[PDB]
Amino acid sequence: PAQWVLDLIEASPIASVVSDPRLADNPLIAINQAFTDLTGYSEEECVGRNCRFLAGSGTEPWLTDKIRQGVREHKPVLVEILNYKKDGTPFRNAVLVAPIYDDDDELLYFLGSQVEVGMARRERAAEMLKTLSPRQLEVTTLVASGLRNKEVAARLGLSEKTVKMHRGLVMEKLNLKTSADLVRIAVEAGI
Numbered sequence: 001p002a003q004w005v006l007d008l009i010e011a012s013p014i015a016s017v018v019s020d021p022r023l024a025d026n027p028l029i030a031i032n033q034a035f036t037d038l039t040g041y042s043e044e045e046c047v048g049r050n051c052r053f054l055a056g057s058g059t060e061p062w063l064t065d066k067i068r069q070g071v072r073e074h075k076p077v078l079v080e081i082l083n084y085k086k087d088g089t090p091f092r093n094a095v096l097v098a099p100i101y102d103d104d105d106e107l108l109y110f111l112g113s114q115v116e117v118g119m120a121r122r123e124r125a126a127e128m129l130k131t132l133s134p135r136q137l138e139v140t141t142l143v144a145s146g147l148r149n150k151e152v153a154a155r156l157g158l159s160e161k162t163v164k165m166h167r168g169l170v171m172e173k174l175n176l177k178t179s180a181d182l183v184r185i186a187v188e189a190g191i
């Protein structure tokens, strides 16, 4: 588990995981404490496994199916799917799954975040984004969609350092500690 992997998720209070698509079946390579407190699954019993172990009998296949669609298109997707905790108790999981890049902006990975639940988080995220300047929104929209800093820059007619500066600016504006969290807020708002 690279340092950045754990920097990215362990800093988030929301149940979060990271998978590696260059491993067969795109298994998880890390989870944070909140995931364990949500599901009851310890990391030893998650890492190396595809996150489908949260799926069960009532899991609506059409929702599972847009997740796999978002994974293969490399696009963020957010659904409220029926999952099952460790004790077997079913729960409504507002699950985000989004393409994310490592520290070197080289390799693609997948970030998942899970919250037990709705439109309230949506309205919330919308209020947070409303405090950002027009340019910070541009940057936020583009990062959330998966792109690299290099790529976001290319789309705004910017340098990679300027974008970095802007991100740091939104991270402190929104009082966030990890990018995982910013991603989820953008997708929640539809931005």
Ligand SMILES: Cc1cc2nc3c(=O)[nH]c(=O)nc-3n(C[C@H](O)[C@H](O)[C@H](O)COP(=O)(O)O)c2cc1C
Binding pocket: 017, 018, 019, 026, 050, 051, 052, 054, 055, 059, 064, 067, 068, 071, 081, 083, 093, 095, 097, 110, 111, 112, 113, 114
């Ligand atoms: C990072 C990540 C997190 C995921 N989290 C969940 C989840 O919390 N709940 C869920 O039902 N599926 C989640 N998925 C997708 C499941 O693995 C999905 O059921 C599986 O990819 C489809 O299995 P199949 O198409 O081989 O039948 C996640 C996928 C990724 C990449």
